[PDB]
Design a protein around this ligand. Structure first.
Ligand SMILES: Nc1ncnc2c1ncn2[C@@H]1O[C@H](COP(=O)(O)OP(=O)(O)O)[C@@H](O)[C@H]1O
Ligand SMILES: [Mg+2]
Lengths: 55, 49, 31, 15, 98, 295, 50, 226, 101, 122, 110
């Protein structure tokens, strides 16, 4: 279940809001701006999801 | 064959059978089930029996 | 003392332990 | 059928 | 000779079905199998003094069938039981001092 | 299949004649460094000298830590090894030099063998002082034992008809369960009945386990494996790591020397590796001069 | 005739072994006897509505 | 409780006895009082200590049970096949040429709770036939392990349905004779043969070499209803 | 066409080109099919094709044989200790044969 | 084991030596009678269960968990009494690292008064 | 009867024989014995296990081990006769170390 919540500085964002082809939409899930930075963030998310790369 | 020798002819004789140790009882019960008229002798307990 | 002692379920005499160790024949301590 | 406050016999043993 | 085979009488008999079971090795099994082989496969018959080989495949057979649960099993691990103690020869001095 | 900046180094790839090839063992180039590293490999494999010092120096992205991992892997697991970083020396519980000595004493190994004596069987009776009765598959023996493990058995909620396992050397007590001979006494009993063990109650075995000197020192100074109330009650009183007196090291050295002289053990020298030693303090650096010039 | 009698005795010995092993499996080793000649408590939870 | 049972694994590498008791200053030669030492644990033994399980799990390392199953791929395959036959409903025979593996099979089947049966020269003569007949009747027993020396010779087994070959060393006709023990006149069902030979080992070459004398007896054996 | 050639082998250390085992088995055919090498070369080929090679040499450094040989060493040591005890005891017997007779 | 408990009987002796317990457990499709020993008896007594309150019990754990009263409010549970499942557990590497460090090291998961874990544990 | 047998077993019956007569018959049967009695293979095992102390690679022959067996077997029997005569000289029909030491100190051990 969900935990106790109060509005914080980062409570508006829920997920990277990216695309399956690693494409950044201008607005997706409380998110906007920094397209290529979000592409890199999704790349790192794929890295951690892989599990075969460390350090 | 033993029954044929016993019935067709008058000779029975003391015969010898040499079988592996785990087939002695199998042969015994086969003799009991078929042609039980023959008088069968076993061989266990070499020192005394 | 060394751990784990083997008892043969006989004798079981914790305080008494000897055979005679006399070299005295008679009973010096008692009758 | 769940009537009454869950009757529970308090028995003693043995005679 | 008095030769008679199964095909001589074909009234009714069970049908034999031949099958082969292929079981892979184990990692510990692979390790110990290679450990034994690499010494016994080309050092026994070429070097050293283990000339005889009539049973040199017997340990390989034992290795294959056993799967090192008979050669060496994992024990109940326990620490060392050293017993000399540091204070073995130090009670006399302190007792005399006191 | 995790891969991280290494694990492609399978060794120095040095020839038996001490001439390194170009590409081998996941390594390319650095022929002189690899040759010297193999020379040092044979040096440590000699196991005759002690307190030798080698420093390898070069710019970044030159596989220095890769070379250290390569020599460590080439040596194998028989020799003790302990990688270290310079910053790990600074601690707050003990002085830095003492931690350096602690890591010194963890870098040499000792191969030892001893006989393990055990007694296992079914619980038959519990006569207070303490005498116990054990039943095996075929054998049966009665044992008199220290009241400490008797109280431990009481704490171990051992019932009647149970099967237990005892290590005679350390007094370790463990209950396997209860015999399947008396198993279906209850429809839904929580206790897991186990079959009776096979063999004599008395059993002797041999082990070949290995330990380092630092392990011996900490075991002697700090007992941290007790079972009865007094043991862990005492050992929980001083959780903080403390200093180790040098006389303890001398006593440990004497006892291991006696062990190897008798002929049931042998000494295995090892390798200590400190990475990025540039940041080490001056006090530790001048302490290394005394520490190295030892036996 | 004697061999047939011996066969019958062998068969009845085999069925004796069978009955003995079944009886051993069904006999159990219960030695609880949780009654005694002493006060004992009982609690019953059920439903009664007529 | 469950996590501390499933996770506390490590044990000390070395420990010195006579210091665990000496830490609290009570030994056979100590400076503490006469009754004070006994009163210490008389007040402390009654403590409901909740760390004894942690101490035990930090002292003795039992080397699990399923690792024995894991180490033997033959054991895993045999367990799978036995479970499949049990689901179908059948009886199985296992033949071994070494006496050092029968105990392993016995303990493994005890762990799985299967009804096993053994036959070896260590047993007597009278018991062998009666136990074999008892196996022939009934259906509760579904597993029978037999040695090669005492299993090659002809025995009446019709209630069996499957024969499993753990290994085969040199069987110009030994294998065929052994697999014929289940295949009898009175077997109403068919005959199932399974060979437990692993790959990439001595067994493959041994089986390849053993497949040389079959054609020899094929050429030799040609008589009958000519 | 006739030849004997005793059949042929392959040897480890693949510094050579691809093994070319096809011509090897074509020529020799292994009437040398004896297990002592049929179980060697096949296993070598399997480990080479699997690549599970470095772990073998990282495990065999201290394996079953090394530990067994070490146990043999300690057995020799304790046998020498028993020899030492025997010579001490017999020397004591000789000394007592003249110190008390 | 989960189902609609029907009857509970507890036979405990006063100044005796033994106790006993008999239960009637029934689902929509079957019923079976079982007799308890010691552990489940005290577990049932300590967690009050009546004829209307429904339960789950594990053999190895021995723990008795309330599953909500059917009456006295839900229909009779269906399916076979026995249920074999798997339960997963996630434990971060640091907690295995600390749990094996010291006999009292488990408390460091909460109080945190640990540190300088010996390198011979990592 | 342990198991399937020739009808009813237990034909052995309680037939214990008291000593004395059994002792007399066994000594009478043993006296006429003239060949070797103890197992020869353990004898050669022990004699080789007690020969390497002087030196190894000594090697042996069947005639040798046979002659040592004959020497040891034909010497202790006269010792047995002497011990028995010393025993029944006193009121001790059983054997105790007293009369065997007596025999040692009258047969000239040194
Ligand atoms: N001969 C080589 N073979 C494979 N990898 C190498 C080789 N030389 C350097 N490297 C890589 O270069 C990196 C640098 O290694 P390291 O010594 O840890 O850092 P630095 O060289 O900066 O001190 C390592 O991750 C290693 O994988
Ligand atoms: Mg680096």
């Amino acid at each position: 279940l969900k935990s106790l919540s109060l509005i914080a500085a980062h409570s508006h964002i829920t997920g990277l809001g990216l695309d399956e082809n690693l494409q950044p939409r201008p607005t997706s899930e409380g998110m906007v701006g920094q397209l290529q930075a979000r592409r890199a963030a999704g790349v790192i998310l794929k890295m951690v999801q892989n599990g075969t790369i460390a350090g | 064959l033993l029954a044929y020798l016993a019935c067709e002819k008058e000779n029975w004789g003391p015969h010898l059978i040499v079988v592996p140790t785990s087939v002695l009882l199998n042969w015994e019960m086969e003799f009991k089930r078929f042609a039980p008229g023959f008088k069968v002798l076993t061989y266990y307990g070499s020192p005394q029996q | 003392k060394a751990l784990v002692e083997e008892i043969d379920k006989k004798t079981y005499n914790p305080d008494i332990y000897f055979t005679s160790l006399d070299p005295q024949a008679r009973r010096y301590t008692s009758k | 059928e769940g009537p009454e406050q869950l009757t529970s016999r308090n028995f003693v043993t043995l005679y | 000779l008095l030769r008679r085979l199964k095909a001589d009488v074909e009234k009714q008999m069970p049908a034999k079905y031949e099958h082969i079971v292929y079981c892979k090795l184990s990692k510990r099994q692979r390790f110990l199998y290679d450990d034994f082989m690499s010494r016994a496969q080309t050092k026994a018959t070429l070097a050293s003094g283990n000339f005889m080989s009539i049973v040199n495949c017997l340990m390989q057979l034992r290795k294959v069938c056993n799967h090192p649960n008979l050669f060496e099993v994992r024990p109940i691990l326990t620490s060392f039981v050293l017993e000399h103690c540091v204070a073995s020869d130090y009670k006399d001095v302190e007792r005399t001092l006191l | 299949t995790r891969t991280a900046a290494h694990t492609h180094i399978k060794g120095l790839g040095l020839d038996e004649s001490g001439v390194a090839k170009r590409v081998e063992g996941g390594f390319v180039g650095q022929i002189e460094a690899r040759e010297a590293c193999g020379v040092i490999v044979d040096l440590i494999k000699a196991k005759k000298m002690s307190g030798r010092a080698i420093l390898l120096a070069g710019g970044p992205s030159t596989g220095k830590t890769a070379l250290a991992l390569a020599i460590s892997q080439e040596l194998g697991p028989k020799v003790p090894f302990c990688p270290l970083v310079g910053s790990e020396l600074y601690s707050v519980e003990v002085k830095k030099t003492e931690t350096l000595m602690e890591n010194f004493r963890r870098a040499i190994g000792l191969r030892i063998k001893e006989t393990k004596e055990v007694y296992e069987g079914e619980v038959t009776e519990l006569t207070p002082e303490v005498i116990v009765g054990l039943k095996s598959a075929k054998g049966t023996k009665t044992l008199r034992l220290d009241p400490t493990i008797y109280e431990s058995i009481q704490r171990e909620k051992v019932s009647i008809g149970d099967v237990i396992y005892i290590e005679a050397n350390t007094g370790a007590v463990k209950r396997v369960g209860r015999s399947d001979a008396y198993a279906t006494e209850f429809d839904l009993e929580t206790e897991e009945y186990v079959p009776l063990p096979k063999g004599e109650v008395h059993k002797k075995k041999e082990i070949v386990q290995d330990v380092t000197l630092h392990d011996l020192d900490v075991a002697n100074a700090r007992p941290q494996g007790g079972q009865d109330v007094i043991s862990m009650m005492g050992q929980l009183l001083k959780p903080k790591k403390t200093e180790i007196t040098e006389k303890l090291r001398q006593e440990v050295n004497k006892v291991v020397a006696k062990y190897i002289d008798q002929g049931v053990a042998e000494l295995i020298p090892g390798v200590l590796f400190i990475d990025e030693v540039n940041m080490l303090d001056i006090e530790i650096f001048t302490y290394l001069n005394k520490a190295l010039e030892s036996n | 005739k004697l061999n047939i009698l011996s066969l019958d005795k062998f068969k009845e010995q085999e069925v004796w072994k069978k009955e003995n092993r079944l009886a051993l499996q069904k006999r159990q080793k219960q030695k609880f006897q949780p009654n005694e000649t002493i006060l004992q408590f009982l609690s019953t939870a059920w439903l009664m509505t007529p | 409780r469950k996590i501390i049972d499933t996770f506390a694994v490590l044990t000390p590498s070395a420990v010195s006895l006579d210091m665990r008791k000496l830490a609290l200053g009570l030994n056979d030669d100590s400076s503490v009082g006469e009754n004070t030492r006994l009163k210490v644990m008389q007040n402390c033994f009654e403590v409901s200590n909740p760390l004894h399980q942690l101490q035990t799990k930090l002292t003795i390392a039992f080397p699990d049970k399923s690792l024995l199953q894991y180490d033997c791929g033959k054991l895993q395959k045999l367990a799978i096949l036995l479970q499949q036959l049990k689901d179908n409903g059948h009886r199985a025979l296992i033949f071994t040429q070494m006496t050092k593996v029968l105990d392993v099979l016995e303990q493994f089947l005890n762990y799985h709770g299967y009804l096993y049966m053994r036959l070896d020269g260590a047993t007597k003569i009278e018991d062998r036939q009666i136990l074999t007949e008892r196996f022939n009747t009934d259906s509760r027993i579904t597993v029978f392990i037999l040695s090669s020396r005492s299993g090659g010779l002809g025995i009446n087994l019709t209630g069996a349905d499957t024969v499993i070959f753990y290994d085969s060393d040199w069987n110009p006709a030994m294998d065929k004779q052994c697999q014929d023990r289940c295949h009898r006149i009175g077997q109403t069902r068919d005959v199932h043969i399974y060979r437990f030979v692993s790959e990439h080992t001595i067994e493959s070459n041994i089986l390849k070499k053993a497949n040389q004398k079959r054609q020899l007896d094929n050429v030799v054996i040609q008589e009958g209803d000519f | 066409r006739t030849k004997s050639n005793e059949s042929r082998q392959h040897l480890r250390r693949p510094l050579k080109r691809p093994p070319l085992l096809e011509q090897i088995i074509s020529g020799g055919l292994r009437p040398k099919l004896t297990t002592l090498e049929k179980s060697q070369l096949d296993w070598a080929s399997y480990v080479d094709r699997a690549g599970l090679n470095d772990e073998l040499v990282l495990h065999n450094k201290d394996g079953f044989l090394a530990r067994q040989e070490f146990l043999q060493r300690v057995g020799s040591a304790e046998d020498e200790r028993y020899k030492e005890l025997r010579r001490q005891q017999l020397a004591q017997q000789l000394q007592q044969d003249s110190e008390a007779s | 084991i989960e189902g609609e408990v029907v009857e509970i009987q507890i036979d405990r002796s006063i100044t005796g030596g033994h106790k006993q317990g008999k239960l009637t457990i029934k689902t929509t499709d079957m019923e079976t009678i079982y007799e308890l020993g010691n552990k489940m008896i005290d577990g049932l007594t300590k967690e009050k269960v009546l004829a209307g309150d429904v339960i789950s019990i594990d053999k190895a754990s021995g723990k008795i968990t309330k599953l909500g009263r059917s009456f006295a409010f839900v229909q009779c549970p269906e399916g076979e009494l026995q249920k074999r499942k798997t339960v997963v557990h996630t434990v971060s590497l640091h907690e295995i690292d600390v749990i094996n460090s010291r006999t009292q090291g488990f408390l460091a998961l909460f109080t945190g008064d640990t540190g300088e874990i010996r390198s011979e544990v990592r | 009867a342990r198991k399937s047998a020739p009808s009813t077993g237990g034909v052995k019956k309680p037939h214990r024989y008291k000593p004395g007569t059994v002792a007399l018959r066994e000594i009478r049967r043993f006296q006429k014995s003239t060949e070797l009695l103890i197992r020869k293979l353990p004898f050669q095992r022990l004699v080789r296990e007690i020969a390497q102390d002087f030196k190894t690679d000594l090697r042996f022959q069947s005639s040798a081990i046979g002659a040592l067996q004959e020497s040891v077997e034909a010497y202790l029997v006269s010792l047995f006769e002497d011990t028995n005569l010393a025993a029944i000289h006193a009121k001790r029909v059983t054997i105790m170390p007293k009369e065997i030491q007596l025999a040692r100190r009258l047969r000239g051990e040194r």
